[PDB]
Amino acid sequence: SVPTTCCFNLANRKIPLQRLESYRRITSGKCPQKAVIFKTKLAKDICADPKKKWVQDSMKYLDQK
Amino acid sequence: YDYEEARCACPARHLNNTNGTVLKLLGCHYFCNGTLCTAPDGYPCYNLTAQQVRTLTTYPNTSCAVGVCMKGTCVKNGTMEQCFKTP
């Protein structure tokens, strides 16, 4: 229930869909700010703002994958 | 794609507390892919002594000074919390 990492720098520019493997939502009010964490195919985690259209669309894409 | 613009958009391990407030960074810096990044100004942090950091684990031990990040320095604000690493 307590996130093991939090996001404090959010990627503003779109990550290409072909690089994305999965995502998780950091919604706990215990992190200083909410975020979506994308995991890439290189197994890196990238923080993004859930309020950007590209973030919501990338989540929809990964839900379909 | 601008890798340089996104170089510091990686998450970081924070410290919890038994005090019911947000998780906070240890200090004001973190690595992304082995490269140095700085937390934004105003971000919550803990300022621990050199003695304290040797025994910082996933359970509290002694009182931790709260602060805020200011140009990469965790500046204390007077509040103390019983902090510990998230697992």
Numbering used by the authors:
A (entry chain B): 4 to 68
B (entry chain A): 15 to 101
Task: Copy text verbatim from the article accompanying this structure deposition.
Evasins are chemokine-binding proteins from tick saliva, whose application as anti-inflammatory therapeutics will require manipulation of their chemokine target selectivity. Structures of chemokine-bound EVA-A revealed a deep hydrophobic pocket, unique to A3 evasins, that interacts with the residue immediately following the CC motif of the chemokine.
To understand how class A3 evasins achieve chemokine binding and inhibition, we purified and crystallised complexes of EVA-A bound to human CCL7, CCL11, CCL16 and CCL17, and solved their structures at resolutions of 1.51–2.01 Å. In all four chemokine complexes described here, the N-terminus of EVA-A is in contact with the chemokine N-loop. Moreover, CCL7(Y13A) and CCL11(F11A) exhibited substantially increased affinity (~10,000 and ~200 fold, respectively), suggesting that the interactions of the aromatic CC + 1 residues in these chemokines had imposed an energetic penalty that was relieved by mutation to Ala.
